[model samples]
Target: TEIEHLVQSVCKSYRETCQLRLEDLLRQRSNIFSREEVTGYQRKSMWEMWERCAHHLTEAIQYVVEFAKRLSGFMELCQNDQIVLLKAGAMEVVLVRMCRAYNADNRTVFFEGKYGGMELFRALGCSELISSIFDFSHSLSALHFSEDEIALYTALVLINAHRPGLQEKRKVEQLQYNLELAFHHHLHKTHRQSILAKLPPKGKLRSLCSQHVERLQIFQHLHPIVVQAAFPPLYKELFS
Candidate 1:
């Protein structure tokens, strides 16, 4: 009861603070989103799409919260290790799905499936989040990206946009090589290898990549290569 009371108090305070902060941020964002140059049906479409995606974004966050709760329950029911593992694995799969959905929604809403549209939004969001985290006195080392890496990271972001055509084995190899090179340039030798070693098997990773690319292509009509180029170079390296 005491812990619950304390948690409620803390969460209430966080909610109030976050709400105020978000209101301020949204007001500023509105100025950018509402410039006279942003007029016309396309602009309206962008805003409307953002509204739809925002709903999905909220739903995804709820899923994440639920996933956390489920994991905590697993920790409690240690006797059900197998079931817990299954739940955790399922949560991971769902989380990836949510991320892809969110990204696709974001691409459509913010970029209108045009050159530099989705990538621009992704870069801006990443920069803003990184700045906010650092300003809040988070450890910079834990941030995982240097300024130079951010540039390269943008390139890798574009890869997802172009990944659908990568069905052939050679294309996959080439993509993997590019990703590896990006990481090698960004990280230390040992760290790069270590991270690479932990990557999922090539076949599984390719399948997942192809699925998301296909979804974005068919549903969103976004070109995977152009989208990938929009990302900073660091993203490609980290994931490659």
Candidate 2:
């Protein structure tokens, strides 16, 4: 019971006395689906589709920041370290978060009450990037992580010590050590130690995010005006 209580303390979401449901987070994607014409020719341009997705991505970044700020020792990190960690890790966390919204049986993501296969994002003009995302989501969802496990794993993702520009590597390392213990305890309690072994390699998440940014820049190059005008400041800051 003491270790259980310790895990609860370290799991930031619990200290805030709020529960985060995947459905609640996916509900924010209603904008993506409100006008989705899944069955017909997509009238939207690549830029328009990307802009919509970017808006959702930006919201996801905000949630990452909120999660980090609530993390037990995150606020104690210097501003530079905090920003650097978030800049480098937020997208990875977002990709991990996607597992919750994924429908493995159909290999689709839930958006506004509908299941969207990669075909649903055809207008994004980057089928390869979309497929990579779908593949990661499908694989991650197959693990069936509990909400607590997801929270702890996300914390580990953000508190990584190796992020470039960290002013206090030791502090980050200590935070990461504590998080890993919590993550291990949670997994052990659930009899899920092999879950870590089965996780997509760290480089996979890194490469997936790099591909996402690469595709974004490619889109911007093709449609400079739309990107300059429509892409939000936060999205540009993170990717550009």
Candidate 3:
């Protein structure tokens, strides 16, 4: 309970600090743009950059709030048998939101420039551990282990041990393998490949898909056991 309380407090404080910084930056930039001396393409470029920064700042604030909510939900489910399932559902929501944030809007220039794609990945990583809790939960759901829940518990233990902050290489390796197995199993049973194929591509969607495929490749190499045996086939079609 104390750990939960401390986590909430820290999240609240960080959110507030980030918000204040964003507001300060916005106001300062607004003032700079309003000055009469600035002109031509320089002014336009500055304004464009400011708008992009402001949009990202706003999105970051929303993410922090969402993350706090998910963390609170996790604390609530900690002791329950359904914790893994609930966590998996919550992670699905968070990852979908992150994907939408990076891919949905045409207005914001958040993931456009040279380093923008990497920055997006970094932001995704920020929420990876919390999201991975959901992944573990999904794994349990797949196994259908009821009275004898050792397999589910063991998977959860491995997942927890391999969270991003944990520097254990073997744990991380095992975790990735298990997670890919879960995702692939679910995807195939549910016919998710068709859905991915049907979705209309936007300007940046192709690149985003490529980036995810690249990550998937890394995961496949590092933890082949977890990956879908036929993932490459579906992955190629999705990106193509």
Greater lDDT among 2 and 3 belongs to 2
Ranking by TM-score: 2, 3, 1
Top candidate on TM-score is: 2
- Candidate 1 backbone clash number: 23
The reply for model 3, stretches above 4 Å from the true place, is: 1-166, 194-240
RMSD of each: 20.2, 4.7, 17.5
lDDT of each: 0.32, 0.73, 0.33
Question: Against the hidden reference, what TM-scores do the models get?
Answer: 0.23, 0.82, 0.25
Count of steric clashes across candidates, in order: 23, 0, 5
Candidate maximizing lDDT: 2
Give one digit per residue, the lDDT tens place, for model 2 in 13-78: 633422346656456444334334574425667677877777666666676777778787888998
1 versus 2: better lDDT goes to: 2
Give the per-residue lDDT of model 1 (tens digit) for 96-123: 3221112121222122222122323332
In candidate 2, which residue ranges exceed 4 Å CA deviation?
A: 1-6, 9-20, 23-36, 220-240
Put down candidate 3 lDDT per residue, 1-240, tens digits, no spaces.
443353344335334433233333323332322123222313344335444533443354344334433432323323321233322232222233232222111211123321122222322332343233333333333333222122122233223422333334453455445534543444465455344343223323223334444554454454432222222432233222
